Ligand code: CLA
Ligand code: CLA
Ligand code: CLA
Ligand code: CLA
């Protein structure tokens with residue numbers, strides 16, 4: 001069958017499933033952005049923009 | 057004249073009485089007469105909390121807060137002697153009343169600041 005490094009080639013001639021895979025990728029990335037923001041808000045100390053700003 | 061049923065659940069019970077704009081008169085003090093405050097009412101409208109200094113040791117400011125304990129903040133039905141002093145100054149000596157309220161206010165970012173808002177032994 002297909003080697004492991006070729007599994008996604010099933011999408012080349014399947015525009016609908018390619019759109020699905022792209023939707024899933026987009027869902028993952030947007031889910032990352034959301035999760036990352038939440039984790040940052042759960043750890044961020046807003047009490048000192050002078051000596052403890054976000055980049056520290 | 058408003059009754060309990062007129063007031064209940066409106067928020068008015070936590071408000072102090074007001075006087076209209078025409079009340080700009082003068083109340084004479086006879087220094088031979090004894091006086092009392094029969095009712096002192098205090099209705100807080102803003103609670104400010106002094107931010108803890110970052111370490112810069114400049115002037116830490118008093119910042120706004122959000123009340124979270126609802127319309128439960130006013131001091132009222134307070135009474136006491138109003139003494140006339142020899143130099144003609146008046147001294148209020150708080151005796152009794154609903155002279156405290158626990159209050160919780162919340163700073164930006166969530167820190168909750170409980171206080172005993174009070175004039176006990178004023
Ligand atoms: C954007 C991500 C993405 C998307 C949209 C797809 C989509 C697709 N894959 Mg591919 N795949 C991916 C990533 C992805 N894959 C990764 C990272 C691997 C290595 C594990 C694979 C390996 C793979 C194989 C072997 C096969 C596919 C196949 C397919 C198709 C059918 C679905 C399937 O069987 O998935 C299977 C893939 C998975 C179930 C992904 C693994 C899940 C990982 C472990 C993360 C799970 C999240 C987890 C909850 C978080 C863990 C947190 C941790 C800190 C503990 C479809 C085109 C099939 C295909 O059609 O072959 C012709 C197929 O046989 N994929
Ligand atoms: C938009 C970017 C993009 C897209 C959509 C594709 C899509 C494709 N690639 Mg190409 N490729 C890319 C960029 C991309 N590639 C980059 C940047 C490189 C260099 C790193 C390559 C090098 C490359 C090679 C050498 C090959 C492909 C192949 C393929 C095809 C099969 C993929 C597969 O089934 O893997 C299945 C993959 C797995 C089952 C697991 C992979 C696990 C990886 C290595 C580690 C974990 C990755 C992690 C989950 C991703 C994090 C996201 C990242 C951006 C930070 C498919 C058409 C194959 C092909 O042409 O088939 C005919 C093939 O041989 N790609
Ligand atoms: C009306 C014309 C039109 C419009 C507005 C779009 C718009 C888009 N296309 Mg293209 N496309 C078109 C014509 C169009 N296309 C035609 C005629 C073809 C040949 C069939 C294609 C083939 C094509 C492929 C193969 C792919 C796209 C993809 C995309 C999306 C990429 C960006 C993205 O996902 O953002 C992020 C998304 C958002 C911020 C949300 C947007 C909200 C959507 C539009 C509302 C959904 C409801 C709507 C009624 C149903 C779908 C609308 C559809 C016209 C796109 C974007 C929504 C890619 C995709 O879907 O990636 C996931 C993709 O893989 N298109
Ligand atoms: C411009 C931005 C961008 C681009 C071009 C891509 C492109 C890609 N992404 Mg997405 N991704 C992005 C942003 C992006 N990503 C962001 C911001 C997030 C949230 C963190 C993700 C989360 C994400 C997940 C969870 C997955 C992808 C996957 C993919 C691949 C799908 C096509 C494929 O089959 O490749 C085949 C794979 C390759 C060609 C190998 C790519 C190798 C990368 C570039 C470096 C790998 C590093 C190292 C070897 C392994 C990681 C270290 C390990 C300790 C974790 C493709 C390379 C999917 C994929 O890799 O499926 C197999 C996948 O599962 N991405």
Ligand SMILES: CC1=C(/C=C/C(C)=C/C=C/C(C)=C/C=C/C=C(C)/C=C/C=C(C)/C=C/C2=C(C)CCCC2(C)C)C(C)(C)CCC1
Pocket residue numbers: 028029030031032035
């Ligand atoms: C369904 C639904 C829902 C929900 C959702 C959700 C809840 C979500 C999510 C999500 C999510 C929550 C997500 C996420 C994600 C993530 C990710 C995607 C990640 C990733 C990662 C990575 C990729 C990594 C990597 C790496 C490492 C690990 C280390 C170092 C290096 C690197 C960086 C490479 C709602 C209700 C709205 C509605 C409708 C339905």
Ligand SMILES: CC1=C(/C=C/C(C)=C/C=C/C(C)=C/C=C/C=C(C)/C=C/C=C(C)/C=C/C2=C(C)CCCC2(C)C)C(C)(C)CCC1
Pocket residue numbers: 032035036037039
């Ligand atoms: C219709 C319907 C339904 C639905 C559902 C759904 C649609 C679901 C889903 C779902 C989902 C879709 C889910 C998910 C998920 C996810 C995940 C599992 C994730 C994760 C993640 C992570 C792990 C992350 C991490 C991180 C990051 C990335 C960054 C920052 C940091 C941290 C670490 C936090 C039901 C059945 C109920 C029934 C009825 C109806």
